[PDB]
Design an enzyme around this catalytic site. Structure first.
Site, short mmCIF file in Angstrom:
data_model
loop_
_atom_site.label_atom_id
_atom_site.label_comp_id
_atom_site.label_asym_id
_atom_site.label_seq_id
_atom_site.Cartn_x
_atom_site.Cartn_y
_atom_site.Cartn_z
CB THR B 37 23.02 -23.02 -72.99
OG1 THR B 37 24.11 -22.07 -73.18
CG2 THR B 37 23.05 -24.08 -74.06
CG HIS B 191 30.42 -17.02 -70.67
ND1 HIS B 191 29.61 -17.99 -70.98
CD2 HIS B 191 30.74 -17.17 -69.35
CE1 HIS B 191 29.43 -18.72 -69.89
NE2 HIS B 191 30.12 -18.20 -68.91
CG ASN B 194 29.52 -20.43 -65.64
OD1 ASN B 194 29.72 -20.19 -64.44
ND2 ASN B 194 28.42 -19.86 -66.17
CE1 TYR B 196 31.34 -24.16 -71.48
CE2 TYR B 196 30.24 -22.59 -70.06
CZ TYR B 196 30.26 -23.80 -70.69
OH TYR B 196 29.19 -24.63 -70.61
CG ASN B 251 32.82 -26.75 -67.95
OD1 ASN B 251 32.20 -27.81 -67.91
ND2 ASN B 251 32.41 -25.76 -68.77
#
Ligand SMILES: Cc1cc2nc3c(=O)[nH]c(=O)nc-3n(C[C@H](O)[C@H](O)[C@H](O)COP(=O)(O)O)c2cc1C
Ligand SMILES: Cc1cc2nc3c(=O)[nH]c(=O)nc-3n(C[C@H](O)[C@H](O)[C@H](O)COP(=O)(O)O)c2cc1C
Lengths: 399, 399
Positions: B37, B191, B194, B196, B251
Site C-alpha cells: 500500500t 489477502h 495482517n 484485515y 491489527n
C-alpha cells in the site's frame, strides 16, 4: 554378533549425557527406553512374567539415572485382548510390578508405566472367549482383512463405543494410573499412538463418528484430552506423559496421506500447552518419528520424509522424547540433541544391548538384535543378550 | 544514500535466479514484489493515481520475468474505508488498472492483483460519511482504543456480519476477480493476512461467533475457504493465490501467544492441498514471516522466534512465497532458496530500489528507504528513487 557394518561414534561429548529433570525425576542422561511389548506375561491373568521380568528390567536399568517406559500394560480386561501382554488392574499383577519397580529403583533409575487400550488391534476371538466386546471408534471401518475374518469367525463384530462406554474407559485409566503410582512407578505414559484405541478416535479414517467424539479436529482429540485431564486430576501432571505418532501408519492409521494430519496433532499439542499455562504442564510429549512408520519394518524401511515432527516444537514448549531409527545414526542424534529439551528413545537396540547407554557414551559396537525372539515366551532373546564385556569374553570378534 | 553498514552478497549463483512457473507465468527469477500500500490513489473514487502509478509499476517491472503483486485493492465500497487506496470495482478504476497492467506486460513481467477487505481496520468515520457499515467478525471485541473512539464519535458501531452479508462479500470478491482478469491481470491474490477482515474471522481473539463461521478451527477458516472456492470456480485455480500471516500480530491478531495458532493455519494449508488432489492446486501460498510481526517496526523489531512457518511445507506441496526482512540478510535467503519451490518477497527494499533484482544478482549496495513518504500523496518517495547508475551519477558515495 555386533552390527556388522556400523561405524559407532561416541556421543559422550553431547547433550545426550547432560542431566535434565522430567516430572519429579532427575535423569542423569537422555537416552530413554521407549515402551517395548515383549509378550512374556502369563496366561491366565496377564501377569508380569514371574521368572524373567525383574531381571530384564533390572538389566536395562543399569546405568544410573535412566528413564525406563515399560511395555504397554492393559488398564483393564476390556482394554486387552492379547493373552501374554501384562495388565495393571488386579492385585496379582500389581504384586509382580512392585518387584520390578523396586529393582529399577535399587539401580537408581526410574520407571513410567505405559497405559494401553487396544481398540480394533485386539484379537476379537480372545475377547469373545472372555465375554468382551471388540471395540473401536466406529463400526463401518475395520482394521484389515485378517481382523475382519477373525471377528466374523468369532462372531464378535466391531462395536462403536457409546459415550457411557468411553466414560468407563476413563474410569479404568484413572484406576490403573492410581495402582501404578501406589505400587511405586514414577509416573504413567498415556499411549495415544500406533493405531491403538485413542489413536483410532484421533484419526479421520478410523473415526467416522457423528457425535461429539468425531467429525472435527476438536471432537477427534476429545477422548485423548479427557484421559489427560482425568489423570492429571487423579495423580498430578508431573506424573503424566503422552505418546503420539503423527505420521504413523501401523494398524491402519492415515499418516502423511491425510492432508489434515498436521492440523490434528498441532491441535493436541496446543491444548497441552494451554494447560501448561494454567500450571499443569505434563511431564513430556513422546513422539514416534516418521523415519519409522511401522516398527515391524527394518531400519530404513518406511521412512516418511514428506513430513516432520518439528512442528511440535513451535507449539509445545516442554520436554519432547523422540524415538525411531536413532541407534544406527549417531550423526542424526548429535544434531538433534543440540536442542536443549530433546530426549532420544532407542527401542530395538535396547532389546539387544542391556548396556546401550555406556556403548553410546563411549562409541562401542552394538549387538545385533534377533527379530525372531521379540515376541517369544523365552528367556532367550530376552535376558541373555550380553554386555560388551561378556560379548568380548564370548569373542564376538574381538576376544 | 545506500544502506550504510550493510555488506551485500551476490546471489546470482543461487536458485533465486532459476526460472519457475507460477500459475500460467514463467518467472525468470524468484524475487517477487509483495503487495505494498502506498496511498497515492485519488479521492473521490479510489482511482489508481493517474499521474504516477504507471511509472512506479513500470519501473519495478524492469528486469523481465518479475512477478509483481499490486497494492491491496478494495473489492467494493463496503470493503474499503481509506480514501486514498485504489479499488477494482468501477469502470473508472479499471480504465487506469488496464494501463498499468499493459505497461508491466510491455516490460515482460507479470501482475497479480491483491483483493483487500478491511473489516475493523477501516476508519469508521469514512465509512459513516459514505453510508457504510463498520464491519468485523464480531461486535464485542474492538481493534483498539483509537478505533473505538473513532467509531463512537462517528457513531458507527462495529457490526457482526450476518451470513447474508458474508455472501455479498463473496459476490463482490468474484466480480472484482473477473474485472482484474478481464482488464489484463495475470491472476489475483486473496489477502487473508495482517489482521484485515478474513484474518479477523480466522483468529480466536477477534472471532467470538457462535455460528458456523466461528467457534472451531473449521468454522473460523470457513469464510477464507469459500472465497478460495468461489474464485477458483469463477476464474480458475491457476489464477488464484492466498496470502497468510500465521504469526502476525499487526491489527490486533493473536500471533504466537495463541497456543492454537499453528493448528488453525495447518488446517487451511491441509484443505488447500485437499483441493490440489482434486486437480485445483492454487498458484502459490504467500506467507508473511514471523521475523517481521508488524511491518511498521524497523527490520529486527518484533522478530517472533518461538515459531516458524516451516510447518506449511509438510502440508502444502505447491510454490510458497515467503516475505519479511530478507533484503538485509542474503545469507538467510541463500539457505532458504536451496528449497526448490520457495520464492522471496522483498517489500521495503523494492520501494527504494527499482532495480532490486539486478542489485541482488550482482551484490550491489542497496538504497535506504524513507519511511516518511511510504504513504504520502507525492511522487517524491515513490517514483524518484534512483537505479544504481543514477545513484552513482548522483554520487551516493561512489561518483
Ligand atoms: C518389539 C517391539 C515392541 C513394541 N511395542 C510397543 C509398545 O508396547 N508401545 C509403544 O508405544 N511402542 C511399541 N514399539 C515401538 C518402539 O517403542 C519405538 O517407537 C520404535 O521401535 C523405536 O524405533 P527404533 O526401534 O528404531 O529405536 C515396539 C517396538 C518393538 C521393536
Ligand atoms: C509501506 C508498506 C505497505 C504495506 N502494505 C501492504 C498491503 O497492501 N498488503 C499486504 O499484504 N502487505 C502489506 N505490507 C507488508 C509487506 O508486503 C511485507 O510482508 C513485509 O513488509 C515484507 O517485509 P520486508 O519489507 O522486510 O521485505 C506493507 C508493507 C509496507 C512496508
Amino acid at each position: 554378533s555386533f552390527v556388522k557394518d556400523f561405524k559407532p561414534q561416541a556421543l559422550g561429548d553431547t547433550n545426550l549425557f547432560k542431566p535434565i529433570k522430567i516430572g519429579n525425576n532427575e535423569l542423569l542422561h537422555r537416552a530413554v527406553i521407549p515402551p517395548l511389548t515383549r509378550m512374556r506375561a502369563l496366561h491366565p491373568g496377564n501377569i508380569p512374567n514371574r521368572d524373567w521380568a525383574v531381571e530384564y528390567y533390572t538389566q536395562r536399568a543399569q546405568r544410573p539415572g535412566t528413564m525406563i517406559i515399560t511395555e504397554g500394560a492393559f488398564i483393564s480386561p476390556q482394554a486387552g485382548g492379547y493373552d501374554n501382554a501384562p495388565g495393571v488392574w488386579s492385585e496379582e499383577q500389581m504384586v509382580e510390578w512392585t518387584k520390578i519397580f523396586n529393582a529399577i529403583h535399587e539401580k537408581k533409575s526410574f520407571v513410567w508405566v505405559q497405559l494401553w487400550v487396544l481398540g480394533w488391534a485386539a484379537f476379537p476371538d480372545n475377547l469373545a472367549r472372555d465375554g468382551l466386546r471388540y471395540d473401536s471408534a466406529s463400526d463401518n471401518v475395520f482394521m484389515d482383512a485378517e481382523q475382519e475374518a477373525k471377528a466374523k469367525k468369532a462372531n464378535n463384530p466391531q462395536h462403536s463405543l457409546t459415550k457411557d462406554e468411553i466414560k468407563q474407559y476413563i474410569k479404568e485409566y484413572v484406576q490403573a494410573a492410581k495402582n501404578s503410582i501406589a505400587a511405586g512407578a514414577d509416573g504413567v505414559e498415556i499411549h495415544s499412538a500406533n493405531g491403538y484405541l485413542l489413536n483410532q478416535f484421533l484419526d479421520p479414517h478410523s473415526n467416522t463418528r457423528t457425535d461429539e467424539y468425531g467429525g472435527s479436529i476438536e471432537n477427534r482429540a476429545r477422548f485423548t484430552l479427557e484421559v489427560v485431564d482425568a489423570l492429571v486430576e487423579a495423580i498430578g501432571h508431573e506424573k503424566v506423559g503422552l505418546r503420539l505418532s503423527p505420521y504413523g501408519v501401523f494398524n491402519s492409521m492415515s499418516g502423511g496421506a491425510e492432508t489434515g494430519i498436521v492440523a490434528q496433532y498441532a491441535y493436541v499439542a496446543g491444548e497441552l500447552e494451554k494447560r501448561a499455562k494454567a500450571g499443569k504442564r505434563l511431564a513430556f510429549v513422546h513422539l514416534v518419528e516418521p523415519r519409522v512408520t511401522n516398527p515391524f519394518l527394518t531400519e530404513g524401511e518406511g521412512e516418511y520424509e514428506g513430513g516432520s515432527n518439528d512442528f511440535v516444537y513451535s507449539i509445545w514448549k516442554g520436554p519432547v522424547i523422540r524415538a525411531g531409527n536413532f541407534a544406527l545414526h549417531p550423526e542424526v542424534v548429535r544434531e538433534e540433541v543440540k536442542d536443549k529439551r530433546t530426549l532420544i528413545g532407542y527401542g530395538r537396540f535396547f532389546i539387544s544391548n542391556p548396556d546401550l547407554v555406556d556403548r553410546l557414551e563411549k562409541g562401542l559396537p552394538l549387538n545385533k538384535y534377533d527379530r525372531d525372539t521379540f515376541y517369544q515366551m523365552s528367556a532367550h532373546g530376552y535376558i541373555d543378550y550380553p554386555t560388551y564385556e561378556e560379548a568380548l569374553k564370548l569373542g564376538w570378534d574381538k576376544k
